[PDB]
Write an enzyme that holds these catalytic residues in place. Structure first.
Site, mmCIF file in Angstrom:
data_model
loop_
_atom_site.group_PDB
_atom_site.id
_atom_site.type_symbol
_atom_site.label_atom_id
_atom_site.label_comp_id
_atom_site.label_asym_id
_atom_site.label_seq_id
_atom_site.Cartn_x
_atom_site.Cartn_y
_atom_site.Cartn_z
ATOM 1 N N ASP A 42 -32.368 25.011 -15.907
ATOM 2 C CA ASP A 42 -31.631 26.058 -15.482
ATOM 3 C C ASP A 42 -29.636 26.419 -16.081
ATOM 4 O O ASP A 42 -29.047 26.044 -15.715
ATOM 5 C CB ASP A 42 -31.548 26.071 -13.443
ATOM 6 N N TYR A 47 -21.703 30.532 -16.277
ATOM 7 C CA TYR A 47 -21.325 29.078 -16.072
ATOM 8 C C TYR A 47 -20.223 28.810 -16.874
ATOM 9 O O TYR A 47 -19.708 26.863 -16.386
ATOM 10 C CB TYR A 47 -23.235 28.135 -15.609
ATOM 11 N N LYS A 76 -29.276 33.579 -17.930
ATOM 12 C CA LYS A 76 -29.450 34.318 -17.135
ATOM 13 C C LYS A 76 -28.698 35.746 -17.143
ATOM 14 O O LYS A 76 -27.004 35.422 -17.855
ATOM 15 C CB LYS A 76 -29.075 34.462 -15.285
ATOM 16 N N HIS A 109 -28.783 37.912 -13.676
ATOM 17 C CA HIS A 109 -28.458 37.423 -12.133
ATOM 18 C C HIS A 109 -28.243 37.365 -10.655
ATOM 19 O O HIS A 109 -28.697 37.092 -10.162
ATOM 20 C CB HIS A 109 -27.564 36.609 -13.022
HETATM 21 N N1 LIG Z 1 -29.103 32.433 -9.310
HETATM 22 C C1 LIG Z 1 -27.863 32.101 -8.552
HETATM 23 O O1 LIG Z 1 -26.928 32.941 -8.068
HETATM 24 C C2 LIG Z 1 -27.636 30.613 -8.413
HETATM 25 C C3 LIG Z 1 -26.636 30.368 -7.392
HETATM 26 C C4 LIG Z 1 -26.608 28.570 -6.730
HETATM 27 C C5 LIG Z 1 -27.061 27.539 -7.911
HETATM 28 N N2 LIG Z 1 -27.962 28.149 -8.539
HETATM 29 C C6 LIG Z 1 -28.413 27.522 -9.741
HETATM 30 O O2 LIG Z 1 -29.236 26.276 -8.702
HETATM 31 C C7 LIG Z 1 -28.680 25.563 -9.197
HETATM 32 C C8 LIG Z 1 -28.766 23.985 -7.677
HETATM 33 O O3 LIG Z 1 -27.607 24.712 -6.559
HETATM 34 P P1 LIG Z 1 -26.396 24.086 -6.377
HETATM 35 O O4 LIG Z 1 -25.385 23.494 -7.780
HETATM 36 O O5 LIG Z 1 -25.282 25.107 -5.494
HETATM 37 O O6 LIG Z 1 -25.870 23.250 -5.634
HETATM 38 P P2 LIG Z 1 -26.692 22.039 -4.818
HETATM 39 O O7 LIG Z 1 -28.143 21.282 -6.402
HETATM 40 O O8 LIG Z 1 -27.859 21.930 -4.192
HETATM 41 O O9 LIG Z 1 -26.075 20.750 -5.079
HETATM 42 C C9 LIG Z 1 -25.692 19.797 -5.963
HETATM 43 C C10 LIG Z 1 -24.359 18.858 -4.548
HETATM 44 O O10 LIG Z 1 -25.040 17.945 -4.615
HETATM 45 C C11 LIG Z 1 -24.571 16.272 -5.696
HETATM 46 N N3 LIG Z 1 -26.393 16.269 -5.445
HETATM 47 C C12 LIG Z 1 -26.934 16.082 -5.949
HETATM 48 N N4 LIG Z 1 -27.894 15.495 -6.096
HETATM 49 C C13 LIG Z 1 -27.614 14.509 -4.819
HETATM 50 C C14 LIG Z 1 -28.207 13.364 -4.538
HETATM 51 N N5 LIG Z 1 -29.726 12.731 -5.462
HETATM 52 N N6 LIG Z 1 -27.430 12.632 -3.655
HETATM 53 C C15 LIG Z 1 -26.198 13.164 -3.504
HETATM 54 N N7 LIG Z 1 -25.907 13.960 -4.165
HETATM 55 C C16 LIG Z 1 -26.289 15.031 -4.649
HETATM 56 C C17 LIG Z 1 -24.100 16.944 -6.812
HETATM 57 O O11 LIG Z 1 -23.281 16.316 -7.054
HETATM 58 P P3 LIG Z 1 -22.977 15.491 -8.765
HETATM 59 O O12 LIG Z 1 -23.699 16.709 -9.413
HETATM 60 O O13 LIG Z 1 -21.497 14.790 -8.730
HETATM 61 O O14 LIG Z 1 -23.456 14.465 -8.638
HETATM 62 C C18 LIG Z 1 -23.223 18.382 -6.572
HETATM 63 O O15 LIG Z 1 -22.426 18.288 -5.231
HETATM 64 C C19 LIG Z 1 -26.768 26.158 -9.128
HETATM 65 O O16 LIG Z 1 -26.195 24.442 -10.592
HETATM 66 C C20 LIG Z 1 -27.645 26.281 -10.569
HETATM 67 O O17 LIG Z 1 -28.627 25.706 -11.610
HETATM 68 C C21 LIG Z 1 -28.388 29.906 -8.777
HETATM 69 O O1 LIG Z 2 -24.203 33.038 -9.694
HETATM 70 C C1 LIG Z 2 -24.150 31.807 -9.768
HETATM 71 O O2 LIG Z 2 -25.127 31.548 -9.951
HETATM 72 C C2 LIG Z 2 -23.645 31.029 -9.212
HETATM 73 C C3 LIG Z 2 -23.463 30.972 -7.769
HETATM 74 C C4 LIG Z 2 -22.325 31.219 -7.169
HETATM 75 C C5 LIG Z 2 -21.276 31.427 -5.693
HETATM 76 C C6 LIG Z 2 -21.203 32.967 -4.885
HETATM 77 C C7 LIG Z 2 -20.911 34.190 -5.015
HETATM 78 C C8 LIG Z 2 -22.159 34.593 -5.932
HETATM 79 C C9 LIG Z 2 -22.336 35.687 -6.029
HETATM 80 C C10 LIG Z 2 -22.112 36.893 -8.004
HETATM 81 C C11 LIG Z 2 -22.097 38.057 -7.753
HETATM 82 C C12 LIG Z 2 -22.796 38.595 -7.134
HETATM 83 C C13 LIG Z 2 -22.121 38.192 -5.522
HETATM 84 N N1 LIG Z 2 -22.944 38.946 -4.471
HETATM 85 O O3 LIG Z 2 -22.986 39.521 -5.115
HETATM 86 O O4 LIG Z 2 -22.413 38.672 -3.416
HETATM 87 C C14 LIG Z 2 -22.425 36.087 -5.699
HETATM 88 C C15 LIG Z 2 -22.787 33.202 -7.131
#
Ligand SMILES: NC(=O)c1ccc[n+]([C@@H]2O[C@H](COP(=O)([O-])OP(=O)(O)OC[C@H]3O[C@@H](n4cnc5c(N)ncnc54)[C@H](OP(=O)(O)O)[C@@H]3O)[C@@H](O)[C@H]2O)c1
Ligand SMILES: O=C(O)/C=C\c1cccc(-c2cccc([N+](=O)[O-])c2)c1
Length: 314
Positions: A42, A47, A76, A109
């Site tokens: 992803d 990013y 995205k 996105h």
């Molecule tokens: N579409 C959107 O708007 C949007 C928004 C947010 C996220 N995303 C996507 O979703 C992905 C995941 O969400 P996220 O990055 O917010 O957070 P997450 O995957 O919930 O958590 C990541 C954190 O957890 C730690 N971690 C990972 N595996 C672990 C394990 N087995 N044990 C302990 N800690 C662990 C990582 O540390 P380390 O990396 O240091 O190992 C990092 O600090 C993002 O990277 C992105 O690709 C999309």
């Molecule tokens: O976007 C990502 O994939 C990652 C992280 C992220 C974290 C907080 C807020 C937003 C975000 C971005 C744009 C708009 C808004 N919103 O409308 O609240 C939040 C994005």
């Protein structure tokens, strides 16, 4: 291990997240991930690390560790590229950075379009984000063109609330339905209503921040913490798994795709070892019961945007 999308392709239910993955660590992270079995990455332009993700993908393709057809690469369209005339170039820049000739899935996105320019969050002098007037239905039509031009195999949406999903589904002249809605989802934000709605329409849901994003920049020492919740630790202990493994298995059993992020090789491998145990229905309902409507990803700067998604109940 894969779920069938409404475009006829199969999507791996476990992928590697890359938000916050430092550019000097993410190439190794993605290489390790592919070596230990990940086939879904992803990504996003915003990013700022797609080039480095791409270096890893390309090395593994070149070395014939994996075939392109076996990978499922997601990116995205950022908010400042919602204008119809900017969508193709944004996609092409992502393809160039990732060193690919197509994406498996390209998402809008966020439903909030912003003014185009160099800044990812264009602000007025008072700190509010500056919107775009481009209708999201027009952005969707531009996304549909990417399928028809061969740049992407599937298109979808992210952070759309149920009314916004409905708006796309009701688009006059809709050509391709969204394949996926990628949304925040974990035991503190279980999203039952939105998930049921999307699944009933044949839209696959991807759960982001499944571990509660403990590396989010705005974390407070007093915030709830999924990885430290003793109730979740207890379920993990019962199954001889880690808390993270339970948190990843949970969405899988709701027929969701899940994209935990790590740049730590040991954790990347740990997070993939989730296909050899099952949570009981009682475990699932117990985890669901922890919902508190606690949301990691939302910005104050966007709360007056007409398309801000999180005012609505779901
Ligand atoms: N579409 C959107 O708007 C949007 C928004 C947010 C996220 N995303 C996507 O979703 C992905 C995941 O969400 P996220 O990055 O917010 O957070 P997450 O995957 O919930 O958590 C990541 C954190 O957890 C730690 N971690 C990972 N595996 C672990 C394990 N087995 N044990 C302990 N800690 C662990 C990582 O540390 P380390 O990396 O240091 O190992 C990092 O600090 C993002 O990277 C992105 O690709 C999309
Ligand atoms: O976007 C990502 O994939 C990652 C992280 C992220 C974290 C907080 C807020 C937003 C975000 C971005 C744009 C708009 C808004 N919103 O409308 O609240 C939040 C994005």
């Amino acid at each position: 291990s894969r779920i069938l999308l409404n475009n006829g392709a199969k999507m791996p239910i476990l992928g590697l997240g890359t938000w916050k993955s430092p550019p000097g660590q993410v190439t190794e992270a993605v290489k390790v991930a592919i070596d230990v079995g990940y086939r879904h990455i992803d990504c996003a332009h915003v990013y700022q690390n797609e080039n480095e993700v791409g270096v890893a993908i390309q090395e593994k393709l070149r070395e014939q560790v994996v075939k392109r057809e076996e990978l499922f690469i997601v990116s995205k369209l950022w908010c400042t590229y919602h204008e119809k005339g900017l969508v193709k170039g944004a996609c092409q820049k992502t393809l160039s950075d990732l060193k690919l000739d197509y994406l498996d899935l390209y998402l809008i996105h966020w439903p909030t379009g912003f003014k185009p320019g160099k800044e990812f969050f264009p602000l007025d002098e008072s700190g509010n984000v500056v919107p775009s007037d481009t209708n999201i239905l027009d952005t969707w039509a531009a996304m549909e063109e990417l399928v028809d031009e061969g740049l992407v195999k599937a298109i979808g949406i992210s952070n759309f609330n149920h009314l916004q999903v409905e708006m796309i589904l009701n688009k006059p002249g809709l050509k391709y339905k969204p394949a996926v809605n990628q949304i925040e989802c974990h035991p503190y934000l279980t999203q039952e209503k939105l998930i049921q709605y999307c699944q009933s329409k044949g839209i696959v849901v991807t759960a982001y921040s499944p571990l509660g994003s403990p590396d989010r920049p705005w974390a407070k020492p007093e915030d709830p913490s999924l990885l430290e919740d003793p109730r979740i630790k207890a379920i993990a202990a019962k199954h001889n798994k880690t808390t993270a493994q339970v948190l990843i298995r949970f969405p899988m059993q709701r027929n969701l795709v899940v994209i935990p992020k790590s740049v730590t090789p040991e954790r990347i491998a740990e997070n993939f070892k989730v296909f050899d145990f099952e949570l009981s229905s009682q475990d699932m309902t117990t985890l669901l019961s922890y919902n508190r409507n606690w949301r990691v990803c939302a910005l104050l700067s966007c709360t007056s945007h007409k398309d801000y998604p999180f005012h609505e109940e779901f």
